Symmetry: C2
Subunit: 197 residues, 2 copies
């Protein structure tokens, strides 16, 4: 039967990257599929082959930010780190990424919502949730994290908390203290709750 | 000189309530000012007096949901409750409101964001944050909550986590367990961390 080629195709990627650049330089609503397409060096047909509209770009943009976030975190790990060290890095990267790409995060909230698909964001996070889940199980087996907790739920809770804290600081502009104090606050809060005796 | 005459319900409230109703009917882009205005029993001029556009309605709608949320929680309290009892009620009400008004919550995320004003939401939550902060201070004094934590930060953290969990369940559709298990999960997570 049919076996999908390894095909690492370019056109789709060319347009998505182009769209990300145009939307950044002038905003989502002032962008033209025309400008995007001409910046990617293709015809309008190439755009519509992959996206029904400008809004349809949101889910794909959110997925790329998510895999970028996970890659960054993994990029700073070797695999044998203790749980708290992994957490430190996850917290640091999340604040760094939120600071630098807040425009994209706000864009995802607006789009996914406008199209009644905020649940797609959960699907998108699956690989990140799954990855943290295994790390928590590994931390439980090594007595770094209290036994009994629901690891699937906890992975998601940890990620929500950290991102909400980062968003409050860089997007909600709650900066009553140095950013390092906020990151330490999240860490201590999580430590007191998941840490073993 | 001037001292604002005391507040009363007028056109503003009429239009906002109408807008909320019209938007529940079809959902924004389908709702026209003519739609809303005719529903509130006024002319189009009354709409533009208070809102420059349909998007301008979002912040006001969000404040009303926040006020409704705080009112609900307070409605179930007498004032002498222990911290864990207040929390339990806060968790229950948040899930209840998210279940019932998820379309309003989604509408707020889409609008405030489209306008580059997600910070307005933090301003909007100020009365809720302050109220919780005061409750946490009282709980610290009564040795119900560990001493030393930052009350302002913890009040916001508590509210974030609870609302994210409720949103994951009703909006994200993460329902791998009965909703009561999720609510209990948040409570235990918070109790192990702030617990005495």
């Amino acid at each position: 039967p049919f076996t999908m080629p390894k095909q690492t195709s370019g056109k789709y990627e060319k347009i998505l990257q182009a769209a990300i650049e145009v939307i950044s330089e002038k905003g989502l609503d002032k962008a033209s599929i025309s400008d995007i397409v001409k910046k990617a060096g293709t015809a309008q047909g190439t755009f519509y082959l992959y996206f029904s509209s400008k809004n349809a770009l949101i889910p794909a943009i959110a997925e790329n930010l998510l895999t970028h976030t996970l890659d960054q975190i993994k990029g700073r790990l070797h695999g044998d780190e203790d749980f708290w060290t992994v957490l430190d890095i996850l917290i640091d990267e999340t604040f760094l990424i939120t600071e630098r790409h807040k425009d994209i995060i706000v864009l995802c909230y607006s789009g996914l919502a406008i199209d009644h698909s905020m649940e797609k964001w959960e699907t998108i996070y699956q690989p990140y949730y799954s990855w943290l889940e295994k790390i928590i199980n590994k931390a439980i087996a090594n007595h770094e994290v209290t036994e009994g907790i629901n690891s699937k739920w906890t992975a998601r809770t940890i990620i929500n908390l950290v991102e909400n804290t980062a968003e409050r600081f860089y997007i909600g502009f709650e900066q009553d203290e140095n950013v390092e104090v906020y990151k330490k606050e999240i860490f201590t809060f999580l430590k007191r709750s998941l840490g073993t005796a």
